[PDB]
């Protein structure tokens, strides 16, 4: 209760400051899930019978808790409704006259808000207002008040939607919005979308206050006949309501004055085509199609009326005739250039005209003379009537034996679909099924024409249609007041694809849709066909009155509920080859029948010849498109041949040259011969040519020169990527939103920036982009953030760069601005950016301000292959796939020959060395001999990792950069006698070879190394090195210019003897100075790589070391565990890098000036890949070597890295929890396989530890060469056999072999005249509980003893004839002073005793000590003395492992610590653990054994928390800040205990590590991952036998 | 109900794994000294083990046990039956070793 | 289960409907729900026999039934006002026809063969040759036999020719060959056989 108390006394409110200068309150979590903490922990203490400390303290602190609860349960919800409301009741505005009772109730409310909020400012201790009197009375009375205002404002809302029907459409906000700004109209404006059918804006007077008429999207203009003005009805449904019955009215009376000036077109022949187009741009494109229907009914049935005698004279061909000269006409017409609207009016009469023309054509020329015939009857039928006086009753639309009247509602102008007879036949079932009440159901394949043919059904009717999309855009909350609007206006509702919906979704809109459909077929009642007491359903709660003219649609691809409600029509195959036939008509082209013939099987083959991508889409839309870009075409050529009717053009060359234009860009390398073939195939001996694009060329062509660029025309190097560039124009031309795809290693970037400054200079428009990485950055931080309290709104990046756009301060269209999402596309993110790449073109934020990009801005999407993205996202853009095959070898082989010849590496001498040497190497990488096979050869090899051309060739340069500048400082050493031209060839030919070996296959192990190097042996003619039987790796290119071996450079060292096998000492060998050399290399290039090789091969000290050998390095050793994200990147910035703005943008730089930093990641493909396979650290670390910076959150500004660097090691990605890094990353980062030391780079590193040793006894000295030889032959031994596969932990490291010289200097530590079986003993003792104990069979166990004597024996003979001293080779501490080898018998009586002791003092259940039970207490006894002593006891459960671990710990007088883990066990609690054990570890000195049990690893996290803890010795991302400061603390008062001078953290932390090396013995029992496997001792605890 | 029916008159409290007062269930049990059966077994809850290890520290005339940080006087006679309703299932050795 | 025969669905079928709306207006709309009755047992026990048949087990169920009579009541009465006994030629057969091929029993049809076989049916029943005596419903019924059309004016003789229908139901009622029972017990016994063996 001492915590408890103590921490009540220092909480604070955190007052925040709100938009109207007020006090709220943040921090709910840390004020809520502390108290509940307390709660419990009160609650158990005064639970638990050690209540006898304290008795009415807890009562009286428990009553207090629940006092704090209460107050704010209440306290939360009172300020969110007050913000809500008040945010209501003053954005809005007219509130005044919108129900001012309840604006008076708000304001009293907020009154006595506002005062409490005063006293809490001026009281912010939390227990000072809870002991204000009346403050929760008031607060609940707060709450009720607010409750209370809130329900009547939603009744009141739900009165006025109910007044006006339309609104019922638009959610409360909306609404709210709307009721609330009557006197700015033109936020009405952009909700009248949602509400009506067709109108988008309504036109008022110069003064807004009269409704001179309405609008549309496209610009079509409807006058009313009798305006309306809000003056006198000022009420906004009011005034509302009589816009729509206006509207109805007006497009009936200009519906009948176009009807009855079409009867003077239709009343015979010769139609004069001047006053048609007068006619045509007269009346709306819905009048005018209604008209045109209308004529034609009635003069067939007028037709059909005279022949009903017989063959009267046929007027029926006179009617077909009109058709045919109407027909003709608008062919004619559609040639001629048209305005886009009338252009639009006209197709819609063409397609109208055909359909009517096949009809009388076909099925009506068969000898049909009756009207009541069935045959005509089928057909939609049109019987206007403009004598009644209703609007709504004039027109009637008659199908089959179906009657329908024509809703009046402005559709503006859409798109009409052909009657094919599969839509005829869904026409006449759908209309049957509505006759008989029933919904229409119908079902087939996506893409079939279900959704569109039921809305063009109900457009055809007049009815507004709703359509519901399935996929991620149903919102249940607004699903039942949508239906209510369907029921009160007598709109549509056609379900996109209802199977899509999950099952509780499914089930409730399935019972709500029942429902409805029993209410709309209680209409036609055969007993209640008279309707005297309107039918209302039953939803949200009320009785809807249902009106006759609502209707639901589903489309199926059905549930049980619906079953007997529903007519299904199956239109799984639509007639693909008439639909383009009319399309193609309808825009002028001769022989349409002939191309549709042509192009639907075309079409029908890419989906079959052609490969499968996520990408292609050759369905109907697709078709649809490329027949309207066709058009356009041929409009185009026409116009062209104008300018120097003309209907000789040949339209199949149009055709293709269309699909080509549109289908193209999307297909990969292989499909475009495919695609070419099947173009051959079905359009025989027609051609296709391309765009010639001169001026744009000649651009490109400079942009690639002084971009050090390839560039070509058609069929020579760098054609297909210079046409990729001319595709990305056409694409940015035809629309926005485009994505560039391709695998990593293609020209994409290049393409994209190429084209901006080509752009740029041709046109002269500034073209600047922003380039944006969406995965490093929170989504939440992408777009933006609504704070719970306060809803405040802070933009994110994306949001903020639109607004940057949009706000008219700098170049909001002067310039282009191209924002490319660079990265990996999914859902996440792109579902705010679905409403930005369609046709909408709009940005909704949640805080509900719209932001609509201006036309010069492009959203480019540059990915590396699409697989994790939405069908919406890719179908709402064009793009252009980038193939491989794009960016030749060669192209680049120029490239970095060309950057090699212009930029300077220290940015005249240095260029003219580098022009040398790039002449020198030439005849290598441009020639297709040297440097291109042996790519080839190393691609048919096998690496550790994938191998990616660009990372293979990258490294390959920046080597050879790096041998430039080695030349450039052997002329600045020697100014007299430069590098001659002949030591110049000679050097750079054996280093281009030597780079090919390290780059080329420099991932692979030796025996690839060596069939590399074999094969360049074989193709090129450069002086090899001599000796044949040593393989080139091993060699090194001398500054000379001759192969020098790598050993001759390898120095020797002498490593003192308190320093042997120290936590960081790194011992020369060919291998470390030979990596050194190649990372130095790559260091100085300042590009990252990372070291890559099996767990304990040398990884982290080679580098380690290698880093701090460097004076201007300041290394950041960093730990990328599962759950690492950029945060931790961030917060290291934020400790050791500082941020500037002086300069012309803002750039990160470390603190220290002149110091360039390393950010060390250990493994770093560690980090876990997200649901969408992309890793959040990965991409940032990419975004921050790539683009060389990052952005801000804080007020989303891009910064550049400076003197920042990264560097990473890690394990293979074959290992466990080693997910492999993207090909995009890891073209950036060249890798180094770290192998094992090989047997002499262990010998070396190991006798240097033997002789370190040995010289603190001087006898023995002369036995180190003996000793190192027979540990690694042993070790190799044991290395061969017991591999990975007979035993996961049979996992062989030379960090074995360091616990084994480390483990034999313990034991002569304070020994002293040790004889030369005494040596041996103490090896053979150490070998066998390094390598005899981890074994699992007693087969193994005498194998491993006998190669023991063996090897004993074979590397010195001089050793007397026992084996080590006897059979059992026993140690132990207990029975002398020193850690003097014991016999048996008494050892095992002193275990017995002290046993005995043991479990008479601390335990209750007797143990027995059997042979297995001594060995193993000798062997955690052996571990625990040695410090950093880690134990790994595999057995089975319950066999005794923690129990000895304990009794030996006991008996060693070790502490014992163990983590009490429960089920919601998290991270921090054992981060907690972790740091309690390592403060009484490295402070205040006490010895602690650490048993972990397999069980108590819950997370993979604790896992590598371990792993970091167990090598390494401490945890660098364990320690921040207050934690810090008084570990701080403690190390120093411990340290002057202990009387050390460290004062520097630096050295202070140096010796807390020392100290928790000392200090902490890790045990972990598990029952029967490699790098756990190493850095502990490994003993099978086997069964009991 | 065999077991619920035995050990009415000790009044045994059923509860599950999956229920989120199970620890506060578990500490009121020990403590008054009642049975107590836990369904559900399938999430076997770590927090169990000191329990059914019988860990037990006779210090100072007051026997107590590890639940976390409060160790709790271990009431005598406190039986805690585990129980689960499906007969193919996998039981960790830990949790199997434990129990009969 | 629905016992298995034309028999037993037509006189389901019959039960079904009430009296009163089959034997008000003209009296051949007692006739006209016969050779619905008929077409509908025709086409649902065709279902069992799936491969040889209905390519795929389609789900013409009651709902279909009473659409294809309503149809059949409001074409009759738009084309008979009155209620004197209309002439064979003037009932609206190319109606009747076309509403049952495309909509109502057509809308559950996939593909273009099994949507012939459904016209197929509806031209051979639903026709004006029906009203002859001698009407065939099925022809080259083992053989030798041949079903005939029970001449009736009211329900009463449709429901005792159904009755008096034999026990000896040959797949060729249905127009499928005689040996189509052969392969339905050969693939029954089959899936006796995968039963019995997945019950080890
Ligand atoms: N003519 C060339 N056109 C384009 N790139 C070239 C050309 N010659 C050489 N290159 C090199 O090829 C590479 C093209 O990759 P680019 O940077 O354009 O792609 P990215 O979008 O950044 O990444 P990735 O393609 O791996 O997803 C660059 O390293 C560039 O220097
Ligand atoms: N050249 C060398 N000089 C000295 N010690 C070496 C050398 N090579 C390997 N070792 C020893 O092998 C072990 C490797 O240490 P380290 O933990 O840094 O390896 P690693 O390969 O980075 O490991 P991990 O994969 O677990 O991160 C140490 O015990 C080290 O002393
Ligand atoms: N009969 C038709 N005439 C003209 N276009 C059609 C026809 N049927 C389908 N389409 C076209 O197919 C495209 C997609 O149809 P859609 O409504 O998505 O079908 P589904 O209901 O299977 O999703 C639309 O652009 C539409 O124009
Ligand atoms: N050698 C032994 N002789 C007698 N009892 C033993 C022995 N080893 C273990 N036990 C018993 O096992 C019980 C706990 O085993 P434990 O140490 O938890 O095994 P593990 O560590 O494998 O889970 C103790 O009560 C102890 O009495």
């Known amino acids: 209760l001492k915590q408890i108390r103590e921490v009540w006394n220092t909480y604070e409110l955190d007052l925040v400051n709100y938009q109207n200068k007020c006090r709220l309150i943040r921090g709910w979590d840390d004020l809520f899930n502390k108290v509940k903490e307390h709660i419990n922990s009160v609650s158990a203490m005064k639970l638990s019978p050690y209540y006898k400390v304290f008795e009415e303290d807890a009562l009286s602190w428990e009553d207090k808790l629940n006092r704090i609860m209460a107050l704010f349960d209440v306290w939360i919800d009172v300020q969110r409704r007050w913000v809500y409301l008040e945010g209501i009741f003053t954005g809005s505005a007219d509130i005044k006259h919108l129900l001012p009772v309840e604006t008076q109730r708000f304001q009293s409310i907020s009154t006595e808000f506002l005062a409490l909020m005063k006293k809490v400012s001026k009281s912010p201790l939390v227990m000072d207002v809870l002991n204000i009197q009346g403050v929760q009375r008031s607060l609940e009375r707060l709450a009720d008040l607010l409750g209370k205002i809130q329900k009547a404002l939603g009744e009141y809302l739900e009165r006025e939607r109910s007044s006006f029907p339309r609104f019922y459409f638009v959610g409360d906000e909306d609404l709210l919005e709307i009721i609330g700004n009557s006197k700015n109209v033109a936020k009405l404006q952009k909700h009248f979308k949602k509400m009506f059918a067709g109108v988008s804006s309504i036109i008022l007077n110069e003064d807004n206050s009269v409704v001179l008429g309405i609008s549309s999207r496209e610009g079509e203009e409807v006058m009313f006949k009798t305006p309306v003005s809000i003056t006198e009805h000022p009420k906004i449904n009011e005034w509302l309501t009589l816009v729509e019955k206006e509207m109805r009215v007006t497009l009936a009376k200009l519906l009948a004055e176009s009807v009855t000036e079409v009867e003077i077109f239709g009343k015979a022949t010769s139609i004069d085509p001047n006053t048609y187009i007068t006619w045509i741009d007269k009346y709306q494109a819905q009048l005018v199609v209604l008209s045109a229907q209308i004529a034609w009914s009635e003069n067939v049935e007028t037709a059909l009326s005279s022949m009903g005698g017989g063959g009267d004279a046929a007027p029926l061909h006179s009617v077909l005739s009109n058709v045919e000269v109407t027909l003709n006409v608008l062919a004619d017409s559609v040639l001629m250039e048209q305005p886009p609207l009338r252009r639009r009016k006209l197709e819609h009469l063409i397609t109208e005209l055909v359909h009517q023309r096949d009809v009388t054509r076909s099925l009506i020329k068969s000898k049909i003379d009756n009207a009541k015939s069935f045959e005509w009857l089928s057909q939609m039928r049109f019987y206007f009537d403009p004598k009644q006086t209703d609007v709504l009753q004039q027109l009637s639309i008659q199908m089959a034996n179906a009657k329908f009247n024509y809703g009046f509602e402005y559709l503006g102008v859409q798109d009409k679909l052909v009657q094919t007879p599969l839509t005829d036949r869904c026409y006449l079932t759908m209309t049957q099924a509505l006759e008989a009440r029933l919904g229409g159901s119908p079902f087939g394949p996506a893409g079939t024409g279900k959704t569109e043919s039921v809305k063009a059904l109900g457009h055809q009717l007049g009815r507004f249609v709703l359509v519901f999309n399935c996929d991620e855009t149903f919102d249940f909350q607004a699903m039942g007041r949508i239906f209510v609007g369907l029921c009160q206006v007598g709109a549509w509702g056609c379900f996109d694809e209802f199977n899509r919906l999950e099952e509780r979704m499914l089930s409730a809109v399935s019972q709500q849709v029942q429902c409805i459909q029993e209410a709309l077929r209680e209409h036609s009642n055969p007993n209640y066909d008279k309707t005297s007491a309107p039918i209302t359903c039953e939803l949200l709660n009320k009785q809807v009155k249902v009106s006759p003219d609502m209707a639901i649609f589903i489309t199926m691809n059905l549930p049980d509920n619906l079953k007997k409600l529903f007519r299904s029509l199956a239109m799984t195959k639509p007639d693909r080859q008439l639909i383009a036939q009319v399309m193609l008509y309808s825009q002028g082209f001769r022989t349409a029948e002939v191309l549709a013939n042509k192009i639907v099987p075309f079409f029908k083959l890419c989906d079959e010849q052609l490969s499968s991508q996520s990408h292609y889409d050759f369905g109907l839309r697709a078709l649809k498109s490329v027949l309207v870009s066709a058009g356009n075409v041929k409009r185009e050529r026409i116009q062209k041949i104008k300018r120097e009717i003309a209907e000789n053009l040949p339209e199949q060359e149009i055709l293709i040259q269309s699909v080509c234009e549109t289908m193209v860009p999307k297909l990969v390398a292989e499909d475009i011969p495919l695609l070419f073939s099947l173009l051959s195939d079905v359009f025989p001996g027609v051609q296709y040519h391309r765009g010639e694009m001169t001026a744009l060329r000649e651009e490109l062509k400079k942009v690639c020169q002084e971009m050090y660029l390839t560039y070509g025309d058609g069929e020579e190097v760098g054609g297909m990527w210079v046409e990729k560039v001319l595709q990305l124009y056409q694409i940015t031309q035809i629309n926005h939103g485009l994505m560039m795809v391709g695998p990593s290693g293609s020209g994409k970037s290049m393409a994209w920036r190429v084209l901006l400054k080509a752009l740029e200079r041709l046109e002269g428009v500034e073209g600047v982009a922003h380039i944006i990485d969406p995965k490093a950055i929170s989504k939440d931080h992408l777009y933006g953030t609504l704070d719970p309290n306060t809803r405040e709104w802070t933009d994110g990046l994306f949001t903020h760069v639109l607004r940057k756009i949009i706000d008219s301060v700098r170049g909001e269209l002067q310039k282009r601005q191209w924002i490319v999402f660079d990265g990996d596309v999914d859902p996440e993110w792109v579902e705010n950016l679905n409403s930005v790449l369609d046709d909408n073109k709009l940005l909704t934020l949640p805080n509900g301000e719209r932001l609509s990009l201006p036309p010069n801005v492009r959203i480019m999407f540059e990915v590396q292959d699409l697989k994790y993205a939405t069908l919406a996202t890719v179908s709402r853009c064009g793009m252009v796939w980038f193939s491989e095959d794009v960016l030749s070898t060669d192209m680049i082989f120029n490239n970095f020959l060309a950057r090699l010849r212009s930029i300077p590496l220290d940015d005249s001498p240095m260029l003219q060395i580098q022009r040398d040497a790039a002449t020198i190497m030439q005849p290598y990488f441009t020639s297709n001999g040297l440097v291109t096979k042996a790519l080839e050869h190393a691609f048919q090899l096998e690496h550790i990792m994938d191998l990616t051309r660009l990372r293979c060739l990258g490294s390959l340069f920046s080597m050879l950069h790096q041998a430039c500048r080695n030349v450039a400082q052997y002329n600045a050493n020697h100014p007299d006698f430069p590098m001659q031209i002949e030591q110049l060839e000679r050097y750079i030919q054996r280093y281009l070879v030597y780079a090919i070996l390290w780059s080329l296959s420099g991932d692979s192990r030796l025996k690839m190394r060596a069939e590399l190097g074999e094969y360049i042996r074989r193709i090129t003619t450069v002086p090899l090195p001599t000796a044949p039987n040593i393989p080139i790796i091993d060699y090194e290119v001398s500054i000379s210019g001759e192969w020098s071996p790598w050993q001759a450079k390898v120095p020797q060292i002498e490593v003192e003897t308190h320093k042997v096998a120290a936590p960081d000492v790194v011992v020369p060998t060919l291998d470390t100075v030979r990596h050194e050399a190649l990372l130095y290399t790559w260091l100085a290039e300042h590009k990252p790589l990372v070291l890559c090789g099996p767990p304990g091969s040398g990884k982290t000290m080679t580098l380690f070391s290698a880093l701090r050998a460097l004076p201007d390095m300041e290394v950041v050793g960093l730990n990328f565990s599962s759950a690492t994200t950029p945060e931790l990147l961030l917060k290291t910035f934020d400790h050791y890098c500082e941020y500037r703005r002086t300069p012309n943008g803002v750039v990160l730089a470390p603190v220290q000036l002149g110091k360039w930093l390393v950010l060390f990641c250990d493994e770093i493909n560690l980090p876990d890949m997200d649901k969408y396979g992309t890793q959040r650290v990965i991409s940032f670390i990419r975004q921050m070597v790539e683009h060389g910076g990052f952005y801000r959150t804080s007020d989303q500004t891009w910064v550049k890295l400076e003197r920042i660097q990264f560097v990473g090691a890690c394990n293979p990605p074959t290992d466990p929890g080693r997910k492999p890094l993207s090909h995009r990353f890891l073209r950036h980062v060249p890798v180094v396989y770290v192998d094992y030391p090989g047997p002499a780079s262990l010998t070396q590193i190991y006798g240097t530890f033997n002789r370190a040793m040995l010289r603190l006894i001087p006898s023995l000295r002369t036995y180190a060469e003996p000793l190192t030889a027979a540990m690694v032959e042993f070790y190799t031994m044991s290395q061969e056999r017991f591999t990975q596969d007979t035993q996961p932990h049979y996992i062989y490291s030379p960090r074995e072999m360091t616990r084994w010289v480390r483990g034999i200097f313990e034991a002569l530590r304070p020994l002293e005249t040790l004889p030369v079986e005494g040596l041996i003993r103490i090896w053979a003792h150490e070998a066998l509980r390094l390598f005899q104990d981890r074994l699992v069979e007693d087969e193994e166990r005498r194998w491993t003893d006998e190669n023991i004597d063996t090897v004993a024996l074979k590397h010195f003979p001089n050793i007397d004839r026992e084996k080590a001293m006897s059979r059992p080779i026993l140690y132990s501490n207990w029975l002398s002073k020193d850690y003097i080898p014991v016999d048996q018998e008494e050892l095992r009586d002193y275990v017995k005793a002290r046993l005995k002791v043991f479990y008479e003092e601390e335990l209750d259940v007797p143990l027995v000590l059997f042979n297995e039970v001594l060995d193993h207490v000798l062997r955690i006894d052996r571990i625990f003395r040695q410090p950093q002593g880690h134990l790994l006891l595999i057995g089975v459960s319950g066999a005794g492992k923690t129990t000895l671990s304990r009794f030996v710990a006991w008996m060693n007088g070790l502490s014992v610590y163990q983590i009490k883990v429960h089920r919601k066990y998290t991270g921090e609690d054992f981060d907690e653990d972790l740091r309690t054990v390592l403060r009484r570890s490295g402070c205040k000195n006490e010895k602690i054994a650490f048993i972990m049990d397999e069980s108590n690893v819950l997370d993979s996290g604790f896992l590598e928390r371990m792993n970091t803890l167990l090598a390494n010795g401490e945890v660098p991302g364990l320690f921040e800040g207050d934690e810090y400061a008084t570990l701080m603390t403690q190390c120093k008062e411990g340290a002057q205990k202990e009387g050390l001078m460290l004062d520097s953290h630096e050295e202070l932390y140096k010796w807390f590590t020392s100290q928790v090396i000392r200090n902490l013995h890790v045990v972990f029992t598990m029952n029967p991952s490699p790098a756990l496997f190493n850095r502990c001792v490994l003993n099978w605890f086997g069964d009991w036998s | 109900e065999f077991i619920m029916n035995e050990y009415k008159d000790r009044k045994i409290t059923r509860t599950s794994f999956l229920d989120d007062a199970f620890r506060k269930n578990l500490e009121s049990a020990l403590r008054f000294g009642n049975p107590l059966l836990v369904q559900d077994v399938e999430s076997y809850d770590p927090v169990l083990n000191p329990v059914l290890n019988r860990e037990v520290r006779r210090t100072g005339g007051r026997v107590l046990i590890t639940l976390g940080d409060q160790d709790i006087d271990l009431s005598p006679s406190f039986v805690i039956f585990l129980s689960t309703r499906d007969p193919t299932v996998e039981f960790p050795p830990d949790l199997c070793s434990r129990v009969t | ?200």
């Open chain 3, 1 to 200: 289960e629905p016992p298995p025969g034309v028999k037993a669905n037509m006189l389901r079928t019959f039960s079904s409907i009430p009296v009163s709306r089959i034997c008000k207006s003209p009296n051949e709309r007692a006739r006209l729900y016969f050779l619905l009755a008929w077409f509908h047992a025709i086409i649902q026990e065709r279902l069992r026999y799936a491969p040889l048949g209905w390519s795929k087990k389609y789900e013409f169920g009651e709902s279909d039934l009473r659409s294809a009579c309503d149809t059949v009541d409001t074409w009759l009465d738009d084309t008979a006002k009155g209620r004197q006994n209309i002439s064979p030629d003037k009932i609206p057969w190319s109606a009747l026809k076309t509403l049952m091929a495309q909509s109502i029993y057509g809308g559950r049809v996939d593909n273009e063969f099994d949507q012939r076989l459904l016209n197929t049916f509806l031209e051979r029943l639903f026709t004006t040759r029906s009203f002859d005596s001698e009407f065939k419903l099925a022809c080259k019924v083992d053989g030798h036999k041949d079903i005939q059309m029970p001449d009736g004016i009211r329900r009463e003789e449709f429901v005792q020719w159904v009755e008096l229908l034999p026990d000896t139901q040959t797949p060729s009622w249905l127009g499928l060959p005689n040996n189509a029972e052969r392969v339905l017990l050969t693939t029954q016994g089959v899936d006796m056989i995968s039963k019995m063996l997945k019950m080890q």
